[PDB]
């Protein structure tokens, strides 16, 4: 039974790594989503006053 | 190994309610890129036309 | 203490399963908004040649 408890120990560590980083992925994407989104209602804008 | 078992169960937990919302910070990003998307097309739309 | 270890086994494989999945759908937003993004900047760049 250690072994077997030692191999989730691992398997917690490496997942808690994993979403670590998607945090960062995730926090990136929204950014750049939301940046997109503004960028292209300002085209939508500009052309309206066109 | 009672506490090494239990420590595993709270990390488990605790990544649970990370992903859980991660889930939805990533459902949210890719909707928020998808109308982007959209509303840049339709910018590029209106420009052809013009 | 048999079951609540594979309680958690099996919890840490369906939450792997659910970090590769978000993983996925981070990729697929990131590359979504980033197209967002650069559509946005193309309409915004036709738009100041106007």
Redesign the interface.
């Known amino acids: ?2 072994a ?2 030692d191999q ?2 691992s ?2 560590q490496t ?2 790594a ?2 670590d980083q ?2 960062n ?6 950014s ?6 503004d ?6 804008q ?2 309206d006053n ?1």
Chains 1, 2, 3 share one sequence.
């Open positions: 039974s250690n077997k408890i989730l120990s398997d917690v997942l808690n994993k979403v998607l945090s992925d995730v926090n990136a994407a929204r750049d989503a939301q940046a997109a989104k960028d292209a209602a300002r085209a939508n500009r052309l066109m």
